[PDB]
C-alpha cells in the first residue's frame, strides 16, 4: 500500500540512525579538544595536504551526505561565523544532549516535556552565567588580555611560544581600534595584512607598524626607497584612450588622421602631467598601466604600482587619510587635480623577503595601521599560524566588546550542572528528569579533557563535583568555585588569579545554539527519500 516509490522509516529506526550519526560526528572531532589534543590532516584526490584542527574546517572538508550531520555542520559553520571561537565544544554539547534525550525518549516519555525541560535548563544556565562574571577593567586589565590570548592560542601550533604572540595581538588590536561615535569601544578585525612567506622561524616574525602590500614595482628604473612621499589613490585605467562602441571615426581628410593619432597619445600624457603636477611620488593603480605611461614615472622619479586590490587601496586611503578619486572631474567642466587629497607616508622601502619582494608602508599622519607577516616552514604551518592568529584576534575582540571574562575549563560546566541538580527539586512535574539529563550532558567536557590527557577521569570528576558542592553551600567557602582543571599534572589549582580566561559571550551563544539544534532535531521521526 501507499504508492510512494521511495525508502521510508517510521518508529525507532530513524531515531537510532540519527543518534549513531551524531555520535560518529562527535567522535570524529573528539581528538582535537583542549590544549592536549593534537591536529588533524586532510588529503584530497590529487595530493594536496591540509593540516588543521579548528573544528569548522574539518566539518567543511569532509563531504557530508547525511542531513543529520549536515545540520551539525551548518550549525558549526554559523557558530564560527558569529563569534569565531568554540566550534567543536558546541557540537560536542549538542551531541551529548541528543544522546541523553534519546534515552528519555526511549523510556516512553513524550518529547514535548523533554524539550520544555531542556529549554528551562538552558534558561536557568543563561541566568546563572551572568552571576559569575569578572570585570576586566576593574582588576589589572593589561594582564587579562594576555592571558586570554595565551588561552586562545594554547591548543594550536604556537602553544609554547604564546608570550610574544599575545603581546603582538594586543598591540595589533590597540593599533587597529577605529574612531566612530565615541560611545562604545569598537575593535574591527579583518584589517591587517597577514602575509605567509617561508624562510625564517617563529621568533623572527615581528610586527610591522604599518600596512604591507603584496605587489612589486612596475619598471626597473623606478626607485625603491622614497622618504617622505605622497600616496596617490586612483581607481581608473592608466592606458591609451579608446572611443566607445557608439562613437566611430570616419576619416574624410588625410590632413587630420595624423593629428588625431597624435592627440590619442598626447591626451594620456597631458593627464599624467596634470596628475603629477602636485608633486606625487607613490601612485597606486588598480587597473593595468601601459608601457608608454611608465616612462614618465621613471623619468620623473616616482613609483607606479599596478594590479592593486580594492580592499588594500581602501585601507591605505583610510590609514593615510587620502580619498580614492575615480575620476579627475570636479564641480565644473575641467579635469583638475588638487593637493588637498594626497597622502603623507613616512618611508616606503621595498624589502626582499625570500626571493619574492613586497612593498612595505610605515605609519602616516592620519591613522595608524598594522600588519603581521607570519613565517613558517612549508605551506601548512603558515596556514595554521594564520588561523591561530585570526582566532586570537577574534577572541581578543570578543573579550574587549563583552568587557567581562569567565574562568574557563571544567569549572563552569560543573557549576551549571550542580545548579541544575539543585534546581530539579523545585520542579515537581515531568520535567525533573530533563533537568538532570541537561546537567549530566554538560559534564562531558571534563570527561573528554581527562580522556585526551590519558589521566584518571572518574576520580577527577568526583573531586571537582565534591569541591563544587562544598563551594555552593556554606558562604565561608565561596572562593572554591574558581578551581578549573589543570591537565598538566591532574590536580585543581587557581584558575582565576593566573589560569584560564575566557569571555562570557562564547558559552551562552554556544549553549543556546546547541539547545536549538537539539530541539529542532528531536522533533524528527519520519524520513522519506524519493528516487532520483
Amino acid at each position: 500500500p501507499l504508492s510512494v516509490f521511495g525508502d521510508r522509516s517510521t518508529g525507532e529506526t530513524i531515531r537510532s540512525q540519527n543518534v549513531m550519526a551524531a555520535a560518529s560526528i562527535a567522535n570524529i572531532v573528539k581528538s582535537s579538544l583542549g590544549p592536549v589534543g593534537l591536529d588533524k590532516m586532510l588529503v584530497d584526490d590529487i595530493g594536496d595536504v591540509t593540516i588543521t584542527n579548528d573544528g569548522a574546517t574539518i566539518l567543511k572538508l569532509l563531504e557530508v551526505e547525511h542531513p543529520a550531520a549536515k545540520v551539525l555542520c551548518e550549525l558549526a559553520d554559523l557558530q564560527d561565523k558569529e563569534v569565531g571561537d568554540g566550534t567543536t565544544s558546541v557540537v560536542i554539547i549538542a551531541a551529548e544532549l541528543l544522546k541523553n534525550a534519546d534515552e528519555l525518549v526511549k523510556q516512553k516519555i513524550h518529547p514535548t516535556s523533554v524539550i520544555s525541560g531542556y529549554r528551562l535548563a538552558c534558561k536557568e544556565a543563561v541566568r546563572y552565567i551572568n552571576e559569575n562574571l569578572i570585570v576586566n577593567t576593574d582588576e589589572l586589565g593589561r594582564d587579562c588580555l594576555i592571558n586570554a590570548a595565551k588561552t586562545s592560542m594554547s591548543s594550536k601550533i604556537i602553544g609554547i611560544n604564546g608570550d610574544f604572540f599575545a603581546n603582538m595581538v594586543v598591540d595589533a588590536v590597540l593599533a587597529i581600534k577605529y574612531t566612530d561615535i565615541r560611545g562604545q569601544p569598537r575593535y574591527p578585525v579583518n584589517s591587517v595584512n597577514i602575509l605567509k612567506a617561508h624562510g625564517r622561524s617563529q621568533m623572527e616574525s615581528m610586527l610591522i607598524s604599518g600596512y604591507a602590500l603584496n605587489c612589486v614595482v612596475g619598471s626597473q628604473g623606478m626607485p625603491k626607497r622614497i622618504v617622505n612621499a605622497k600616496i596617490a589613490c586612483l581607481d581608473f585605467s592608466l592606458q591609451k584612450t579608446k572611443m566607445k562602441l557608439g562613437v566611430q571615426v570616419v576619416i574624410t581628410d588625410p590632413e587630420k588622421l595624423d593629428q588625431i593619432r597624435q592627440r590619442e597619445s598626447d591626451i594620456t600624457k597631458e593627464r599624467i602631467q596634470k596628475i603629477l603636477a602636485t608633486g606625487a611620488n607613490v601612485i597606486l593603480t588598480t587597473g593595468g598601466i601601459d608601457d608608454m605611461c611608465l616612462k614618465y614615472f621613471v623619468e620623473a622619479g616616482a613609483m607606479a604600482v599596478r594590479r592593486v586590490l580594492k580592499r588594500d587601496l581602501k585601507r591605505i586611503a583610510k590609514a593615510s587619510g587620502a580619498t580614492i578619486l575615480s575620476t579627475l572631474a570636479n564641480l565644473e567642466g575641467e579635469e583638475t587635480f588638487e593637493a588637498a587629497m594626497l597622502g603623507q607616508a613616512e618611508e616606503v622601502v621595498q624589502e626582499r623577503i625570500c626571493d619574492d619582494e613586497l612593498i612595505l608602508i610605515k605609519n602616516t599622519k592620519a591613522r595608524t595601521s598594522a600588519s603581521i607577516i607570519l613565517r613558517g616552514a612549508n605551506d601548512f604551518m603558515c596556514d595554521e599560524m594564520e588561523r591561530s592568529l585570526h582566532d586570537a584576534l577574534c577572541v581578543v575582540k570578543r573579550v574587549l566588546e563583552s568587557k567581562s571574562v569567565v574562568p574557563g575549563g571544567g569549572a563552569v560546566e560543573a557549576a551549571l550542572s550542580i545548579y541544575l541538580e539543585n534546581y530539579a527539586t523545585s520542579m515537581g512535574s515531568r520535567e525533573q528528569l530533563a533537568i538532570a539529563e541537561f546537567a549530566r550532558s554538560l559534564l562531558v567536557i571534563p570527561n573528554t579533557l581527562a580522556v585526551n590527557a590519558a589521566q584518571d577521569s572518574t576520580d577527577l570528576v568526583a573531586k571537582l563535583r565534591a569541591f563544587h558542592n562544598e563551594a555552593q553551600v556554606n558562604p565561608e567557602r565561596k572562593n572554591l568555585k574558581w578551581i578549573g582543571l589543570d591537565l598538566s599534572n591532574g590536580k585543581p589549582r587557581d584558575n582565576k588569579q593566573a589560569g584560564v580566561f575566557e569571555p562570557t559571550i562564547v558559552k551562552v551563544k554556544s549553549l543556546k545554539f546547541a539547545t536549538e539544534a537539539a530541539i529542532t532535531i528531536l522533533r524528527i521521526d519520519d524520513l522519506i527519500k524519493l528516487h532520483p
Binding site: 545540520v71 551548518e74 550549525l75 554559523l78 561565523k81 558569529e82 563569534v83 584612450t241 572611443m243 566607445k244 557608439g246 562613437v247 566611430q248 571615426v249 570616419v250 576619416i251 574624410t252 581628410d253 587630420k256 593629428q259 588625431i260 592627440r263 590619442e264 591626451i267 578619486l325 575615480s326 575620476t327 572631474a329 564641480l331 565644473e332 567642466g333 545554539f513 536549538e516 539544534a517 529542532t520
Partner: protein, 180 residues
C-alpha cells in the same frame, strides 16, 4: 543619515541613448574632446538638477537594456553627499510606493521636490556575520503595510517559523471574516 528625503528614480543616469540606432561620426581632432566635455556637462547638469530638489536617499530601478548609473554620476552623487541604492526590482514598486509614500518619477522635467517622501531615519545595520541589511523607520504619511523579520539558526527552522506565522495570519483572517 538623519532626516532624509527618499526619492524614486525610474530613468537611467548614463550616456544619452535614443530608441533608434544612434552613432557619432568623428572627423576632427577636437571632436573627441568636445564629445567628452559635452557628456561631462550633461552629467553635471543632471546631478545639479537632482541635488536642487534636496534629495538624500536615491532609489534607481533595475535596467537591463542600458547602464542605470555610470561611474561619473556615482562619483558626483558621492561628492554631493547623496546615498545611492541602485537595486530596485520591478515587482516591489507598489509596495514601496504604499509604504514610504513616494510617487515614481520617470523624467527629470517632473522631478519636483513635493514628489518626495519624508523620512525620519534612513540608516543601515550590520549583523554579526551574515550580510548587511537596510532598514527605513519613520514616515510622515505611513500606509497600511508592515514587514516581519524572521531569524533562526538553521534555514529549516526559519522556514518552519515563517509557515507558522503564515498559518496564524490565515487563522486570524478567517476569524475576522467569519466574526464567530
Amino acid at each position: 543619515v538623519e532626516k532624509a528625503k527618499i526619492g524614486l528614480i525610474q530613468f537611467c543616469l548614463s550616456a544619452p541613448k535614443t530608441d533608434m540606432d544612434n552613432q557619432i561620426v568623428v572627423s576632427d581632432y577636437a571632436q573627441m574632446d568636445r564629445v567628452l566635455r559635452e557628456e561631462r556637462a550633461y552629467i553635471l547638469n543632471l546631478v545639479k538638477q537632482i541635488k536642487k530638489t534636496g534629495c538624500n536617499v536615491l532609489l534607481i530601478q533595475k535596467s537591463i537594456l542600458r547602464d542605470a548609473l555610470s561611474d561619473l554620476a556615482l562619483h558626483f552623487l558621492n561628492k554631493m553627499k547623496i546615498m545611492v541604492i541602485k537595486d530596485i526590482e520591478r515587482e516591489d514598486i507598489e509596495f514601496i510606493c504604499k509604504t514610504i509614500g513616494t510617487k515614481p518619477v520617470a523624467h527629470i522635467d517632473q522631478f519636483t521636490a513635493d514628489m518626495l517622501g519624508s523620512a525620519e531615519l534612513a540608516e543601515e545595520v550590520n549583523l554579526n556575520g551574515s550580510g548587511k541589511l537596510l532598514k527605513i523607520t519613520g514616515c510622515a504619511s505611513p500606509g497600511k503595510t508592515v514587514t516581519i523579520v524572521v531569524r533562526g539558526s538553521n534555514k529549516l527552522v526559519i522556514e518552519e517559523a515563517e509557515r507558522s506565522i503564515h498559518d496564524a495570519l490565515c487563522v486570524i483572517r478567517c476569524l475576522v471574516k467569519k466574526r464567530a
